[PDB]
Specification:
- This is part of a larger assembly, with eight protein chains of seven kinds.
- Helices cover about 35% and strands about 35% of the residues of chain A.
- Chain A is α+β, with helices and mostly antiparallel strands.
- In chain A, a hairpin with a 2-residue loop joins strand 7 and strand 8.
- In chain A, about 55% of the residues are buried.
- By secondary structure, chain D is an alpha+beta fold.
- Chain D has a single domain, classed as 4-Layer Sandwich (Glutamine Phosphoribosylpyrophosphate, subunit 1, domain 1), CATH 3.60.20.10.
- In chain D, a hairpin with a 2-residue loop joins strand 3 and strand 4.
- Chain E has a single domain, classed as Glutamine Phosphoribosylpyrophosphate, subunit 1, domain 1 (4-Layer Sandwich).
- In chain E, helix 1 packs across helix 3 and helix 4 runs antiparallel to helix 5.
- Chain E starts with a strand and ends in a 9-residue tail after the last strand.
- Chain G is α+β, with helices and mostly antiparallel strands.
- In chain G, strand 7 and strand 8 form a beta hairpin.
- In chain G, helix 3 runs antiparallel to helix 4.
- The radius of gyration of chain G is 17 Å and the shape is globular.
- The chains are: A alpha+beta, B alpha+beta, C alpha+beta, D alpha+beta, E alpha+beta, G alpha+beta, H alpha+beta.
- At the C-E interface, loops of C face strand 5, helix 1, strand 7 and strand 13 of E.
- Strand 12 of chain B pairs antiparallel with strand 13 of chain D.
- Bound molecules: the ligand O=C(NC1CCCC1)[C@@H]1CCCCOc2cccc(c2)C[C@H](N2CCCC2=O)C(=O)N[C@@H](CCN2CCOCC2)C(=O)N1 (3 copies).
- One ligand YRE sits at the interface of chains B and H.
Chain lengths: ~210, ~210, ~260, ~220, ~250, ~250, ~220, ~200
Amino acid sequence: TTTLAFKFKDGIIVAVDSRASMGSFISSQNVEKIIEINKNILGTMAGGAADCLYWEKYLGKIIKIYELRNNEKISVRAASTILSNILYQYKGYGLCCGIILSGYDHTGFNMFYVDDSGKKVEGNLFSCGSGSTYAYSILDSAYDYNLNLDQAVELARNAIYHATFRDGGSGGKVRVFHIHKNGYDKIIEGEDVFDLHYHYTNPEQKDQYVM
Amino acid sequence: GSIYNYNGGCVLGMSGSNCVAIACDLRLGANTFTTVSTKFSKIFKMNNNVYVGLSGLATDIQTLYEILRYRVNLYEVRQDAEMDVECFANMLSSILYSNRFSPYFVNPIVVGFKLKHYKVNYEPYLTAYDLIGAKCETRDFVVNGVTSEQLFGMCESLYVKDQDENGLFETISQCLLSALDRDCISGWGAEVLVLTPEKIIKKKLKARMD
Amino acid sequence: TLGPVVTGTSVIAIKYKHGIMIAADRKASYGSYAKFQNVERIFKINNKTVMGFSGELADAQYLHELLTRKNINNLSEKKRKEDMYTPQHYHSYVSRVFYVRKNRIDPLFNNIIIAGINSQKYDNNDDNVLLYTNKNNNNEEYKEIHKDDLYIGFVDMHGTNFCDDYITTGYARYFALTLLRDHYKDNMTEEEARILINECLRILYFRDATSSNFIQIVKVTSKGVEYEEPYILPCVLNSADYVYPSTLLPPAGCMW
Amino acid sequence: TTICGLVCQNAVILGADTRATEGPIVADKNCSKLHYISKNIWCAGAGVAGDLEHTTLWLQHNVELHRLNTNTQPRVSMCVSRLTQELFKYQGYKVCAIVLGGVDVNGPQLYGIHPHGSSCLLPFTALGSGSLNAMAVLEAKYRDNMTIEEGKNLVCEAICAGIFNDLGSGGNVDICVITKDSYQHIRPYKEPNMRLYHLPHPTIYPKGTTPILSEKIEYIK
Amino acid sequence: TTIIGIIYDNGVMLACDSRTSSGTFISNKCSRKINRINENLYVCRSGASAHSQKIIEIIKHYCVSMKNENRKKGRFHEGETIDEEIDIDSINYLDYNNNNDNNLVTKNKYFYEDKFNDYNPLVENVAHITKKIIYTNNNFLSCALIFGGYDKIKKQQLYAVNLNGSIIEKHDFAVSGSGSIYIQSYLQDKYKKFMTKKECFNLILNCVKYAMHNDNSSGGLIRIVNITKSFVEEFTVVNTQMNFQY
Amino acid sequence: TTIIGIIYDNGVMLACDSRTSSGTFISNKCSRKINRINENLYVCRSGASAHSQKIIEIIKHYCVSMKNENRKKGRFHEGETIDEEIDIDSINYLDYNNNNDNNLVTKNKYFYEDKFNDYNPLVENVAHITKKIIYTNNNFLSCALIFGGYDKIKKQQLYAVNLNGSIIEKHDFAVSGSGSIYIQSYLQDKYKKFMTKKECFNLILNCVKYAMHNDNSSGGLIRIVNITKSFVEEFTVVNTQMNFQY
Amino acid sequence: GFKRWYPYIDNGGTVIGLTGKDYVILAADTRLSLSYSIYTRFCPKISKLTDKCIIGSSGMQSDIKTLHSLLQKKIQLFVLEHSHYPDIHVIARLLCVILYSRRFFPYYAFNILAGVDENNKGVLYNYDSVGSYCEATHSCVGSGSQLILPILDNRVEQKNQLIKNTNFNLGDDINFVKDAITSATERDIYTGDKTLIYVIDKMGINVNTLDLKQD
Amino acid sequence: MDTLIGLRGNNFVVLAADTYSINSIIKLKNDDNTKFYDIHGNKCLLLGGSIGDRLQFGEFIRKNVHLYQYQNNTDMFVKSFAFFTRKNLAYYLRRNPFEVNCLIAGYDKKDGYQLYWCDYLSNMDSVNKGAHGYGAYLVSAILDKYYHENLTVDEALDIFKLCFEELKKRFLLTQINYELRIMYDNKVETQYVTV
Ligand SMILES: O=C(NC1CCCC1)[C@@H]1CCCCOc2cccc(c2)C[C@H](N2CCCC2=O)C(=O)N[C@@H](CCN2CCOCC2)C(=O)N1
Ligand SMILES: O=C(NC1CCCC1)[C@@H]1CCCCOc2cccc(c2)C[C@H](N2CCCC2=O)C(=O)N[C@@H](CCN2CCOCC2)C(=O)N1
Ligand SMILES: O=C(NC1CCCC1)[C@@H]1CCCCOc2cccc(c2)C[C@H](N2CCCC2=O)C(=O)N[C@@H](CCN2CCOCC2)C(=O)N1
């Protein structure tokens, strides 16, 4: 698994791969690792599939109730606090959850990393999963807050591609969503990394690439 | 068990009519999920009629290949002839068993031609091993490596008796690629060698790289 | 219970043309010690249902108590013979008990067979049930019962449950079951069923250390549940090579 | 695995299934489990495949050496002594459960050898994962002084019991009959298992369907 | 397993069950736990089958070496000039098995070649070399043995080689195996000095029968070997079932 | 520990050794393993001492409750009107101990208060409530019990409550403890139906004596309780040594 | 002492699913095994949930039976409380929550949900033991899954074939399911005896059988 | 952990490592010299792992290769050197293992510029780029992304600088001192870099 998100001048880019594994066997290549928490908050899934799915859907329910009760939109910080408290309550039980919560609210664009150990870290750039070190290195090497939407999407795609290239746990399709003031757009619904390799690393397609 | 997951990889042998094919993935893993190489061939030529595919722990692959090359070269220089594929297969079994209690962590296959000298007839020859040298002589296909179950399914479903060289190539390549697409720790390229008594065709497949 | 201490070995139950024939040797062992040699291992639940067990005797007695009182309460509420619980009902109940105990990691260390007649149309025994009197021990004849009306269920420690025409537990799952899958047939007479069961029990006596040759046979038929008179099974060796003296073989080498 | 043997009139009959497993997967569907030791001595093997292959090969070649050096008919007792001593030397870590049978000056003999080195002279026996099923059949139906045809039928029935009731067994039934003057290895003898459903047409991939990156042709001689 | 030895007035009798099991499964119904070492020297095996078998094979080899080394040079005995049979058939008669298998050899008897006991190894010597072998490797070997035999010095003798490689000579009876614990007091109560052949045979047979009745690890058939100064008799008993009035 | 029960023609006899040990050390030389539950209901204790003691205390309390609940209202039996001695002194005579301790009470006898068995709990009921208690906590409790008693329904009875909380009724004899394994076949061979009081007493005493001879965990003295329809007799035997001709 | 009893056992077997445009195929073998012995040759692994939805499972048979019966109970209760039958998607979410309720003492069951939604789309959901689930066009659970899933990938997706096939239909799909299960039976010791092939399409649920090898 | 990085081009090979000597929680030195083992004849062995094992294995290899070259009065081929190294490591793997990771580089006329990647299990393959240590996770993708054939030495050094900045910024151990070995144009040069 490789998920990532970063702020830039037009909002937040969120990109993920789509592989699911059972041990070393590939259970699926079409799983959806970006979960809409509400109209303005997206969640990414890394780690246990059931844990991420269940607790992000549970957070969605909590936030729906909150926003009905108080007639206002929850903040990303509050959503992340709720999730981190819920997960910390299960410490030692063995939950495997790596989650990035990104969204827009009245305080602007926000991004938090929440893991099963209760960690809750505000930031502007995160990556989770087995492939996250590769995505980190690519992003840090080529990250500028003043990138336009096209550049930001291209960078996210390239980072996901390199992660899936080096990490056996990541692969399938790259999805790149864009979060903005009025919700989010799916710039790249799903693009097989197969084409990405023969587009970036070996466009000649005349012999096997050598690492 | 996990030792075999350290590197990953797999090998596959198949026979047609007067032809035989051997294929492998090209990945060198490390720590079960890090790909460090994409040109690490598991296929080794002992002589023109004898190939061996060695999957498993890469250090043991290289070590066993060197031992086998030493033994084959000595045998052939002493005898002044090419080693018969069956003699080589039995020798490989004996070498693996000689380490019965501290074995090489390898999953070999042997693919080649058994020559029946009258004119000469070339009978495809296939054998799969376990790490202590138990042997499985077969006529259709052999598999080994962490991808063994997927290769077994693909071969049982798709193998076709008495295919010509092109049909053999398409079949073995499809079996290998489909099997690899379901493995997290194998793939990153495929080499396919199709053997005939007259020529060897070496192909690299445009495979998945994730 | 943390593990078996006093155990019974194996039970065999098969459908034949007049109902169920279930068998078990009357033995309960304390490890390799054959402490109890006259133990009942097949219990009557009601006039149409029996319970056999292998494994721990204390757990089996507990389950037998549960079912005894369940049948009593069933009879307490009965207004017509159709109200009596079927063998299928008791099999479901036992499978449920086992499943619940598995989920607590507190299983009964038994394999259970629940067998009987799944219909009320073959007789009027359940019209006036006698718990403490038996009239079978009059000169009527057995009715052939369609196999579909007969029930033989199995429950193991993990709650695995299924039904079949013949069920075995313990070592009978290897020795008896092989011969049954080869040789059982529908609508067997009491003679043929008894002969096949006896062949299975003879093999078990020769090959299962926990088994004995003192066999209790129970029948569930149109006349109800009948306990046959326990009998000793005659088991003779099937080769003179066994009985040949060792001194008549060569004195040299590994001759033994 | 299911291997079994019995003694009949002036003959020993061995039988085996042909499945080899690697975990829950069938690795070889037609592996041979009956091993030629000498013209009058065969053996059937269950346990670890590599151990069986190499132990039976070593035994066969040492027996031939002994026969050449003494110019006498090999004895089944010699195979028992050699095999049991080897297996005992390895304290059961050489997992070889072997049914050894043959005919010599002491008549037809059959031994059940166990990986720890024990042996037992028997009129019949079965070994392997299916040995309980085969032993059920043999105990039910064995008799002294059976004819060779009756013995063959019984051995086949016992192996089939193992094949159909034990997941570790399967494939065909192989049989060998060992008399004083020769043996008869029948492989397969039964063939009770075949693929039932076949697709109406075998999938033939059109030429050029697989994408390739590079190709080189290298001729030979 | 049950193995017994009893010394009686004119010899020593060895008896055994025949069951070999691996857990609850009976791998061998009728093993042969009483093995001839020399023409007048037998051993009853208990414990792990592989261990006792390989030990006994080694001991047989050692006994051949000793015997041939005991042979003196020359000729001897240029002048020296050197009981009620058990009704085995009636012991083995059962109503439901009468001529069901007519061909059945349940008895054998042979005479000693070394009539004067000129070279046969002493029972004590063979027993002690066995004890030595077991003791030297008692970190791995687990088997208990009973040696019975006749030599011209000490006459009929019993030696128990216990687990861990200790040796004790018995002058009345010896018992070993998981089944003998059950017949311990029965044998103690019924044994007397200078028993006849008939009394000893009946007693040893009943001991094995009771042990088989009570011990799941024992069963099969009963093999009885009787060792006298001039001959050895062996019997097989297949009527093993025990009938209680109550 | 050895505990035995034997049913004879006119009653049931319970016997026991008296040794309690902590490893190889004998913490109590003469414990009391046969305990009165009701005037006609005794239990023989085996297993861990604390377990059997606390179980029996609970059972005695339960038995008092049952007995007083069994009392029917009113008056009954307005008309109803309701064997060779054991020479215990001669059993207990030893040459080297004659008047060495004159004051020694080795016997006691008492008659039942509930002559008609109007309210005494059934032996089966008490045994089964005990089985229930043991089974409910059979993850922790390790003790085997023999119940012997007399009630007007089933007469003299033996119930074995085995380890893990199973119950079996015995109609001839019951044995438990590490010492009984040795006398298993001795008792099986010597027991017959409808024994006299004298025969039963001699047999049970000899069983305990043999078990003490063979089992290190058994020893001390022998306590024998005889339960009839009208009275209970208790004996102590201190002559426990076993003399073998051989 | 006594070892702690393990509360799990794999009873073996395979379940295979394959969607079409207007149909779904769910097939399962019927062997019931325990270690290397066969409890019975006929233990169906597919239960009907609704007229348009079935469930097939592999794993511990006691768990599968309890879970199928619990799901049937919950669905009948839903029908009584809410006056309508739940769609396949509703049942999928419900099964997810049921499985996750035992996240820490899981059911040993791998379950495929098969059905056709209101739009007459063939639907498949496949699950892990703790409630993770995903929608798929073909899936397989059980001992034979790692043998069968590559074959169905090759036939259905054709990702590694330049000359593709786009003529899919019910008869060919059923033939592919039968070939896949037979090929699995060839190699997986726990799959065999007999297979039940369920087909859901416009009319409803139809059942057919195919014989597998017995060894 | 010891971060090792190697990059080979058509005309060069570059190796790089952190310059830290670590004893538990303290840095013994910020200018470690126990990682690079220059070997006569345009060859270089770079090692990571425990300092003791590094010193032992590296000096053993260097001395044996120098012995070979003095005895045969010739330079060992780079490939021969790599496989001799791998075989010695594999010999000791099952007897008394050297827990060391290796990058092997060199030039010779037969094969040009060569880079071999070998791990502590003696798994080896020739590569165009490679890394060892925990920092491999953070530099490998950069190596992949910015590498191409026909890269110049200056371009490769810029790639290495990218790697060093990423290690300083994102790696838990903030490594900022590095040493590089550059082989090209029949000369071996040493550089030190601080980020
Ligand atoms: O890919 C995955 N994460 C990515 C995909 C989505 C989000 C990111 C993880 C990768 C490993 C997760 C480790 O943490 C666990 C937490 C709890 C349980 C288990 C593992 C064991 C469980 N196992 C093992 C065998 C039997 C079983 O139930 C199991 O590995 N489950 C698979 C689910 C795969 N599919 C199920 C249905 O379809 C959708 C996904 C799973 O969680 N994988
Ligand atoms: O069927 C079998 N015996 C019969 C078949 C013919 C003769 C009798 C056994 C059945 C199970 C025994 C497994 O206990 C082992 C103990 C120690 C070592 C190994 C196995 C080695 C190895 N192991 C162990 C796990 C990883 C691995 O690889 C392994 O499982 N060997 C397989 C055969 C391997 N293949 C060789 C070539 O192709 C045919 C099969 C094997 O011996 N099976
Ligand atoms: O050149 C050699 N001999 C010279 C050195 C002294 C005088 C002559 C021989 C070469 C013979 C080639 C035959 O093929 C093999 C035959 C048997 C075994 C192995 C290979 C694999 C074994 N392997 C592989 C990795 C782990 C392991 O144990 C291994 O290579 N053994 C080394 C001995 C290595 N030590 C010898 C003394 O020097 C220090 C190292 C070995 O046999 N060398």
